Amino acid sequence: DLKGHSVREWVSMAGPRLEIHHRFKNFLRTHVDSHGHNVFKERISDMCKENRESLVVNYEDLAAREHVLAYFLPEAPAELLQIFDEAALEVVLAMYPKYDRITNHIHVRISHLPLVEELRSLRQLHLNQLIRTSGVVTSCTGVLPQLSMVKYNCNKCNFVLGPFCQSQNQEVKPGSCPECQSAGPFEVNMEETIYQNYQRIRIQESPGKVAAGRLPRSKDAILLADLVDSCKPGDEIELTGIYHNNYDGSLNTANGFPVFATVILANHVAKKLTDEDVKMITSLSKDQQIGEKIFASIAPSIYGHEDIKRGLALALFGGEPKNPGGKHKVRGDINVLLCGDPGTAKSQFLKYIEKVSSRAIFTTGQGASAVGLTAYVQRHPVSREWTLEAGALVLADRGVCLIDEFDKMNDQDRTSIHEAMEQQSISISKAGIVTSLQARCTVIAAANPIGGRYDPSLTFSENVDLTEPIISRFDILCVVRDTVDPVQDEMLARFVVGSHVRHHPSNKPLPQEVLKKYIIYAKERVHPKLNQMDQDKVAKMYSDLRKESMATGSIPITVRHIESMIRMAEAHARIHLRDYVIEDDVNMAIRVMLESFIDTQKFSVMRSMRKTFARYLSF
DNA sequence: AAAAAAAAAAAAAAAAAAAAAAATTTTTTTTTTTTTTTTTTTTT
DNA sequence: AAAAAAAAAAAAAAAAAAAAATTTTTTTTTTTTTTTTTTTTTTT
Ligand SMILES: Nc1ncnc2c1ncn2[C@@H]1O[C@H](COP(=O)(O)OP(=O)(O)OP(=O)(O)O)[C@@H](O)[C@H]1O
Ligand SMILES: [Mg+2]
Ligand SMILES: [Zn+2]
């Protein structure tokens, strides 16, 4: 019921405390379901099955069945939340009385609060009220331990001053010891205390929602005991919490308006491997067109460059790493370099790889890089803790670093990427950190040739500004020429304009994550083995290719290329999800490796090799 | 050989950690001085 | 034999003495960061 006094004082009175606690118990037990299920029974069943420590309830259901509580909720949320903690504790103990050891506490979260305010507009009129809001996490410190029921050693006599509850507002302070009667220098008993997880995030208004002439505004937020690490930086998150002012934040200091900071005790944060995967992946792997389906599922937002779609497929699935003895580093990573004249989807390719492949990061030879190739240690600014920011490769240790504009990286990045793909370990020796972080990168890269146009007369090495050892070890070199042509340009223009009209704001092969599950399955679980290839055929293949390449200015095919051939064979076997490499796979790996080698070779020699080796490129 | 560009050095400014600096009378006890009362010893 | 002086013991009151007692804030220091100058190094 209602009276002249305020809502908060009302709900503070004991009579209505029992009233609303009874009402919460009542609808917890009785609000069966939309369609007669008693959903609270099943929710509590799962809650205690995992020991989640936290229930969540829908505000629409709350208000619809019992509306007085819903109206009271934003007015004096703290008191209602405490009582619902107690009532939920009662009902969960009723369902499972064995729960008593489990945390002695249940939190309750409220979802779908109808009235969302915007971080631009949170005024005095929302203090001490439960609001709903949206934003992006700009920072999120680590999980810290907070006092929740603290016991103090009176260090005059070592009496254990009993467990004081710790509100978020002001630090608890014992008056005196019940034994020796001193307000002594008390100090926390580290053990008998039962702490509580504390994490501090900072959300800000999303640029997609910020207005024209503006700076997005940022509100702090505190996560406690179950929601810590429920959201990482850059996550678009809805936040529901008690917008809050009265803790100790106030500019009572000199030189300041009497102006208060604010926080949000977050009461609900909402962001915005498997089984049967073997079944689906193997069932489609039966099809045996799966190689071309993968080749046509890789990079659908690009036209042409089928050679590079295939090549990046082989780079994505990789080979296998081996070490005969503890003496020979032979690698499973297939490194790729697109070299292309401008405006030919190099960065488009790279961003597709970043989107699709797990443990992918992006980096640029220029200084605009999100993540850097070098490794450095400093005090990271948004956290101000002294990190070892290990570079881009190490951060992409398993999967892919993607080096866009590979042809302009500063000489330090040249040194670092060379030493990465050569050693496969990045050797840091800056402050006192003389270590070697292993970097099993699978580098993809893009490079614009000299003069902004590919020059078929000169060779690849001398018309791209990447020095010989760097250009060598890349398992695939691909050339991208923007050759003017009627039908090609017609097709490209029609595709682009179709995308544009489709992407007007009025209109608002295998799927990509299907391919991603395929990627991890065939990258870790499946290791095709090789005793089933015409060893003599490939040995004579190297013989014939190098024998033709014997000439001046004709740096020949070598063992680098023959091991790259085996890597590509394994990769195609992986791609076929087989457990044994087959002559078909060996033929395809031969085809792609030889295509890469001839197109590396300049025009006249390219035509000689193409004419005399068309039998393999025929397949 | 001199000009342009880049890298490193020098110097000022800021943020946090941890060691220093400052404030700071009132109530209870209990010994000592004084008085008082009952008794015994001595004198009229 | 009665009166009285003295003795010891008991009590009240005033002066002196006894005892009790962590917390908050400020400042130096260290350490990085940033700007701008100077220096050095690469180019035509
Ligand atoms: N084959 C293609 N299919 C689709 N879009 C393409 C293709 N070739 C070029 N484009 C378009 O060209 C534009 C430039 O693409 P991209 O970012 O890859 O440039 P680039 O050639 O790598 O240039 P740069 O050297 O400046 O990085 C993008 O709009 C991309 O869509
Ligand atoms: Mg590009
Ligand atoms: Zn004590």
What's the CA A184/C1' C44 distance, rounded, in angstroms?
79
Residues 6+ apart with CB under 8 A from A456: A481, A602, A603, A606
Q: 């998150």: which residue's tokens? A: A237
Nearest CA to ligand 1 atom 31: A345
In DSSP terms, A104 is beta-bridged to: none
Amino acid symbol at A567: R
Q: 């208000």: which residue's tokens? A: A63
Chain gaps in chain A, named by the residue before each (C–N > 2.5 Å): 272, 508
- CA of A412: nearest nucleotide by C1' is B7
The answer to whether A438 is a known ligand-binding residue is no
From CA A203, how far away is CA A377, in angstroms rounded? Answer: 27
CB contact at 8 A, A193 and A151: yes
3-state helix/strand/coil string of A96-114: CHHHHHCCCCCEEEEECCC
Cβ atoms within 10 Å of A310's Cβ, excluding its own: 24
In DSSP terms, A476 is beta-bridged to: A336
From CA A369, how far away is CA A372, in angstroms rounded? Answer: 6
The DSSP symbol for A208 reads: T
Phi, psi of A305 (to 5 degrees): 55, 40
From CA A410, how far away is CA A40, in angstroms rounded? Answer: 61
What's the CA A168/C1' B13 distance, rounded, in angstroms?
35
DSSP notation for A164-197: EE--SSS-------TTT------EE-TTTSEEEE
Phi, psi of A422 (to 5 degrees): -90, -60
Give the rounded distance of the alpha carbon of A485 from its chain centre: 41
Residue A282, token pair as written in the block: 């193997």
Nearest CA to ligand 1 atom 12: A343
What's the CA A181/C1' B32 distance, rounded, in angstroms?
34
Nearest CA to ligand 1 atom 21: A343
In DSSP terms, A187 is beta-bridged to: A153
Q: 């029921």: which residue's tokens? A: A149
Any idea how long chain A is?
619
Query: From the CB of A348, is ligand 1 less than 6 Å away?
Result: yes
From CA A136, how far away is CA A271, in angstroms rounded? Answer: 10
CB contact at 8 A, A87 and A26: no
Nearest CA to ligand 1 atom 6: A345
From CA A447, how far away is CA A244, in angstroms rounded? Answer: 53
**Chain A, 366-425: which CBs lie within 7 Å of strand C?**
378-379, 381
From CA A137, how far away is CA A272, in angstroms rounded? Answer: 12
CB contact at 8 A, A152 and A232: no
Residues 6+ apart with CB under 8 A from A462: none
Angle between helices A512-520 and A277-285 (to 10 degrees): 100
Question: In angstroms, how far is the first alpha carbon of chain A from the final one?
Answer: 84
Burial class of residue A435 in the structure, from the number of CB atoms within 10 Å of its CB (0-12 exposed, 13-18 middle, 19+ buried): middle
Number of the ligand closest to the Cα of A175: 3
C-alpha distances in Å from residue A533, one per residue of A8, A340, A529, A570, A587: 81, 34, 10, 11, 10
From CA A454, how far away is CA A603, in angstroms rounded? Answer: 12
**What is the pairing mode between strands A218-224 and A194-204?**
antiparallel
The answer to whether A358 is a known ligand-binding residue is no
CB contact at 8 A, A480 and A488: no
Q: What is the CA radius of gyration of chain A?
A: 32
From CA A521, how far away is CA A526, in angstroms rounded? Answer: 7
Query: From the CB of A343, is ligand 1 less than 6 Å away?
Result: yes
Resolution, expressed in angstroms to one decimal: 3.2
From CA A425, how far away is CA A429, in angstroms rounded? Answer: 13
Cβ atoms within 10 Å of A236's Cβ, excluding its own: 15
From CA A605, how far away is CA A610, in angstroms rounded? Answer: 8
Helix spans in A5-76 (H): 7-12, 14-30, 39-50, 59-65, 67-75
Burial class of residue A125 in the structure, from the number of CB atoms within 10 Å of its CB (0-12 exposed, 13-18 middle, 19+ buried): exposed
C-alpha distances in Å from residue A51, one per residue of A94, A105, A143, A425, A509: 15, 11, 20, 42, 42
Least Cα distance to A313 among A352, A366, A369 occurs for A352
Angle between helices A290-297 and A512-520 (to 10 degrees): 120
Residues 6+ apart with CB under 8 A from A217: A119, A120, A204, A205
From CA A531, how far away is CA A156, in angstroms rounded? Answer: 78
**What is the pairing mode between strands A434-438 and A107-111?**
unpaired
Cβ atoms within 10 Å of A6's Cβ, excluding its own: 11
From CA A534, how far away is CA A519, in angstroms rounded? Answer: 28
From CA A78, how far away is CA A71, in angstroms rounded? Answer: 14
C-alpha distances in Å from residue A540, one per residue of A341, A543, A557, A592: 36, 5, 13, 18
In DSSP terms, A58 is beta-bridged to: A111
Least Cα distance to A130 among A239, A231, A292 occurs for A239
CB contact at 8 A, A170 and A247: yes
Return contacts of A481-490, CB within 8 angstroms, 24+ apart.
A481/A340, A481/A341, A481/A454, A481/A456, A482/A340, A482/A341, A482/A342, A482/A343, A482/A344, A482/A453, A488/A304
Residue A550, token pair as written in the block: 């014997």
CB contact at 8 A, A261 and A250: yes
Least Cα distance to A577 among A273, A276, A295, A278 occurs for A278
Least Cα distance to A353 among A444, A420, A273, A421 occurs for A444
From CA A587, how far away is CA A604, in angstroms rounded? Answer: 25
Coil, strand or helix: which one is A228? coil
From CA A350, how far away is CA A316, in angstroms rounded? Answer: 12
Q: Is the CB of A383 under 7 A from strand B?
A: no
From CA A400, how far away is CA A355, in angstroms rounded? Answer: 11
Report how this structure was experimentally obtained: cryo-EM
